[PDB]
Amino acid sequence: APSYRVRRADISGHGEEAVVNAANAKGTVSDGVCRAVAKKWPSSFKGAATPVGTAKMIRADGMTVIHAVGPNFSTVTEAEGDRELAAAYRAVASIISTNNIKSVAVPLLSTGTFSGGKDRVMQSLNHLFTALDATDADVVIYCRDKNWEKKIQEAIDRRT
């Protein structure tokens, strides 16, 4: 059984065994979590392009980086994006499990420039739970916002 906690902090300062990048399909550096990951582990982007709804792992710069591509909700229907977001987190969980990764720092996929102008924190979080529940990892959810942190914490507590 996995554990979940939430941390309001820069994901690049995480204390876990692996980190999930909120990647884009082309493997390019963009603002936010992605830029933080690229500054800290710059060689982790080599060959990281992966389709929407999948994830791709690399060991680089003494870190395990999982590039997970959630959908851009401007470019898919609502139901399609929901399916793709679910798949992205399932791909993450698969990488966690198959590589015996014991703790992981995870951002909320598709919540920023990919959100298509809708609040997706809870949508993303609930897919995160469903997927990583298949694992036994200590999951640390990273956010920047004090509003989000309490919301996520409530959600974790509601499960307890």
Numbering used by the authors: 1 to 160
Paper text:
In this TRC, nsP3 has been for a long time the least understood nsP, but recent studies revealed some of its functions in viral replication. nsP3 is organised into three domains: a macro domain (MD) at the N-terminal, a zinc-binding domain (ZBD) and a C-terminal hypervariable region (HVR). Macro domains can recognize ADP-ribose (ADPr), poly-ADP-ribose (PAR) in their free or protein-bound form, or O-acetyl-ADP-ribose (OAADPr). In order to better understand this mechanism, we initiated a structure-based study of the Getah virus (GETV) macro domain, which shows a peculiar substitution for one of the most conserved residues in the catalytic loop, namely serine replacing a glycine in position 30.
The structure of GETV macro domain consists of a central twisted six-stranded β sheet (strand order β1, β6, β5, β2, β4, β3) sandwiched between one α-helix (α1) at one side and three α-helices (α2, α3 and α4) at the opposite site. The two molecules present in the asymmetric unit are virtually identical, with an r.m.s.d. of 0.22 Å between the two chains. In particular, the Cα chains of macro domains from the three Old World alphaviruses GETV, CHIKV and SINV superimpose well, as illustrated by the low root mean square deviation (r.m.s.d.) values of approximately 0.7 Å. The structural homology of the GETV macro domain (OW) with other alphavirus macro domains such as VEEV macro domain (NW) and the MAYV macro domain (OW) was slightly lower with r.m.s.d. values of 0.9 and 1.4 Å, respectively.
